[PDB]
């Protein structure tokens, strides 16, 4: 069984085919290297992440200033978690599955990148491998999305009451869920949570790299990614 709270979280998930077709159609309607393409994917996915958050349970109760503070804190972690889960579900050996449904060979991306991006990509695929081995599932994924979004490290929130509540109760429901549905993995809950600091680290390194690439003139023109990089 799935705890009531997690059932409520699942109801807020986007229609994946609709989002997939939207981004593919936008990029189709749109002189771009593979790196530029990845930036465009990130930018378009951020619009979908904001739309998802805005309409989600609990988040929709927050005033816009609180909503902004939370998203400014975690946007890159949500992008990376989204990517990681997509590889867990749809990915395979030596290929990368994109939000458009496009599958690209890993070397097509990696051979064209320098050390920093290669390291980040490699670290991301290690998380993919680890979460595979844990049998990371959709219920756990949506829980982690909410734990990433409702961070206790965000200062000056007006409604910290609600944010701490969500963090506490999603934690409780996730533990209940993993203890129930994966009893043979007695430490699954702890192993899932250990991935959050790793995602934070990768996300911060990714932001620093993209910030450098923007200063260097390598990030294609966009609206949202650049604004979030300055968040």
């Amino acid at each position: 069984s799935i705890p009531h709270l997690i059932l409520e979280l699942l109801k807020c998930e986007p229609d994946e085919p609709q989002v997939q077709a939207k981004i593919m159609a936008y990029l189709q309607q749109e002189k771009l290297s593979t790196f530029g393409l990845m930036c465009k994917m990130a930018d378009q996915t951020l619009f979908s992440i904001v739309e998802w958050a805005r309409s989600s349970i609990f988040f929709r109760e927050l005033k816009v200033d609180d909503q902004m503070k939370l998203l400014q804190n975690c946007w890159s972690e949500l992008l990376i978690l989204d990517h990681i889960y997509r590889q867990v579900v749809h990915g395979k050996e030596g290929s990368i599955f994109l939000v458009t449904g496009q599958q690209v060979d890993y070397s097509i991306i990696a051979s064209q990148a320098g050390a920093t991006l290669n390291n980040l990509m490699s670290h991301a695929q290690e998380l993919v491998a680890k979460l595979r081995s844990l049998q990371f599932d959709q219920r756990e994924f949506v829980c982690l999305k909410f734990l990433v979004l409702f961070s206790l490290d965000v200062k000056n929130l007006e409604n910290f009451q609600l944010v701490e509540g969500v963090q506490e109760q999603v934690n409780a429901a996730l533990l209940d869920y993993t203890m129930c549905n994966y009893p043979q993995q007695t430490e699954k809950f702890g192993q899932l949570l250990l991935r959050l600091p790793e995602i934070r680290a990768i996300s911060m390194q990714a932001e620093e790299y993209l910030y450098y690439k923007h200063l260097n003139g390598d990030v294609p023109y966009n609206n949202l990614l650049i604004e979030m990089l300055h968040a």
Binding site: V50, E51, R54, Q67, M68, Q72, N223, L224, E227, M228
Partner: peptide
């Protein structure tokens, strides 16, 4: 932090 575009996307 102030960010006119993010604010707009959340409000619309």
């Amino acid at each position: 932090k102030e960010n006119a575009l993010l604010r707009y996307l959340l409000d619309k």
